[PDB]
Design an enzyme around this catalytic site. Structure first.
Site, short mmCIF file in Angstrom:
data_model
loop_
_atom_site.label_atom_id
_atom_site.label_comp_id
_atom_site.label_asym_id
_atom_site.label_seq_id
_atom_site.Cartn_x
_atom_site.Cartn_y
_atom_site.Cartn_z
N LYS A 179 0.75 -1.26 0.00
CA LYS A 179 0.00 0.00 0.00
C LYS A 179 0.79 1.31 0.00
CE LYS A 179 -4.26 -1.89 2.01
NZ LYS A 179 -5.26 -1.74 3.09
N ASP A 183 -10.45 2.22 1.13
CA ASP A 183 -10.52 1.79 2.53
C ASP A 183 -11.26 2.84 3.34
OD1 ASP A 183 -9.26 -0.72 2.64
OD2 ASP A 183 -7.26 0.18 2.76
O1 LIG Z 1 -7.60 -8.95 2.09
C1 LIG Z 1 -7.89 -8.27 1.11
O2 LIG Z 1 -8.20 -8.87 -0.04
C2 LIG Z 1 -7.91 -6.78 1.19
C3 LIG Z 1 -7.61 -6.20 2.35
C4 LIG Z 1 -7.59 -4.69 2.57
O3 LIG Z 1 -6.23 -4.30 2.81
C5 LIG Z 1 -8.16 -3.89 1.35
O4 LIG Z 1 -7.68 -2.54 1.41
C6 LIG Z 1 -7.74 -4.55 0.01
O5 LIG Z 1 -8.26 -3.81 -1.09
C7 LIG Z 1 -8.28 -6.00 -0.06
#
Ligand SMILES: O=C(O)C1=C[C@@H](O)[C@@H](O)[C@H](O)C1
Ligand SMILES: O=C(O)C1=C[C@@H](O)[C@@H](O)[C@H](O)C1
Lengths: 261, 259
Positions: B64, B100
């Site tokens: 991220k 998010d």
């Molecule tokens: O476990 C997941 O697939 C995700 C977790 C989060 O960090 C979200 O921000 C991400 O877009 C998807």
């Protein structure tokens, strides 16, 4: 559902609504594509609305150049061309792209028009700059002309092309009308008949009337020709893919525009 | 067809593929959403692949923050948060967004969790930062805490919030646990809010002691699944213009979990 629109003036006669209605149903998507008359002075407020209620919009005269200043991001190509014909709205932000350029090259292939130069683009406005950009990208020798020379010179100098006087059209192998001469006027053509080359191809972006004086002259002169519908359909299909990630059938969109005029 | 993926390491336990398979199906679209293990080292190369073969991808730990440097444009919100969890690819260009934050707010709203202040965010990571930013913009008085002091103070300074001691949780009316790095809370049961709501950003668990403690204390509760569904539905709309049913995505995940 997907909310699209073509912004410009005049737009009541646009064939885009018909093409993308086909695109939507063809892909099994729910949505609409309307023509929204938008004069230059209304552009700023119009884009504000786009940010809130439209997934994307196409831009036509006289908004393509003025739009760049009101967007959050402009594609590298649209920056060089100086014109945006497709806007994508995401999270209230507006992204500008130009599908006229890639659409033109796709249309040429669809028409069996050989990528052979010198290619002369008549008109150095937004459409002309997009065509010149596309032909340059395709690797051809490009010449440009404009009723006001400085506009053609600026283009040739910026893109590294050649600005020429109109009579050089007799030596071009591909002639493209990117001027508005001929629009709704069967008596007008941007080029005197005697300046057409005796061999090669011609393409007209003006599609109202479909068979313009320019195209009729080119066909009678012994040149291979293509109307403005194939480019209209391809730039549209490409814009739809930018908006959704899906590519509607270009030939289907062309057929839809044909039936709409 | 539409090609999507969630990039991260590890991503073998991600519920995104399950949710988005429902998104595609329910919306009558053809495509795929796959989990693709992507250590931080393969990130530059993976994004180059994204530019050419994917319409969009979600990013999770530990990509991220490192992803911002490799994108063509980053949203104002994602820049402030310092994290991108959603990437859109158009004409080979990459745009980064953060769903998010808005997903979290919409999940609280749809779940009937009142935005009663002061709010306290436990944890100052990508999730915590996104949550703090979201709550601040919603108009709440927002406090932050972190196991590591400096981390909380930095976040407080950046956003104009206040870093507080763990005991202040008793005064919070909205408590969010964002210390669940990658699926035990750091909050003793005796320091839980008197009244209000507690949200545990945990996705796979059906329940947690943190949540059972809050529930027993009489607080309204919510796990992290609604947020996951909403950040996911918002990402899908960013990619296609179509919003899949958030409730549907959450149900898909629960069925996948077998609970
Ligand atoms: O476990 C997941 O697939 C995700 C977790 C989060 O960090 C979200 O921000 C991400 O877009 C998807
Ligand atoms: O007539 C029309 O509807 C259009 C014409 C061209 O300017 C295109 O570039 C525009 O996207 C739509």
């Amino acid at each position: 559902m997907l909310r699209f629109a073509v912004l410009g003036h005049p737009v009541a006669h646009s064939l885009s609504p018909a093409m993308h209605a086909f695109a939507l149903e063809s892909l099994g998507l729910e949505g609409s594509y309307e023509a929204w008359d938008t004069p230059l002075e209304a552009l700023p407020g119009r884009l504000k609305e786009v940010r809130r209620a439209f997934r994307g919009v196409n831009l036509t005269l006289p908004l393509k150049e003025a739009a760049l200043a009101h967007l959050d991001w402009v594609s590298p190509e649209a920056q060089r061309i100086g014109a945006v014909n497709t806007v994508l709205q995401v999270e209230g932000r507006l992204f500008g792209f130009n599908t006229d350029a890639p659409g033109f090259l796709e249309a040429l292939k669809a028409g069996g028009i050989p990528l052979k130069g010198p290619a002369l683009v008549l008109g150095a406005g937004g459409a002309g700059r997009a065509v010149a950009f596309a032909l340059r990208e395709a690797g051809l020798e490009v010449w440009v002309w404009n009723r006001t020379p400085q506009r053609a010179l600026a283009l040739a100098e910026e893109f590294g092309l050649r600005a020429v006087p109109l009579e050089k059209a007799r030596e071009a192998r591909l002639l493209v009308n990117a001027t508005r001469v001929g629009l709704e006027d069967p008596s007008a053509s941007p080029l005197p008949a005697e300046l057409f080359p005796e061999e090669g191809a011609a393409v007209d972006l003006v599609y109202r009337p479909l068979w313009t004086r320019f195209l009729r002259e080119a066909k009678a002169k012994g040149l291979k020709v293509q109307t403005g519908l194939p480019m209209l359909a391809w730039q549209g299909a490409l814009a739809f893919r930018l908006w959704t990630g899906l590519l509607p059938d270009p030939s289907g969109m062309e057929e839809a525009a044909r039936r709409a005029l």
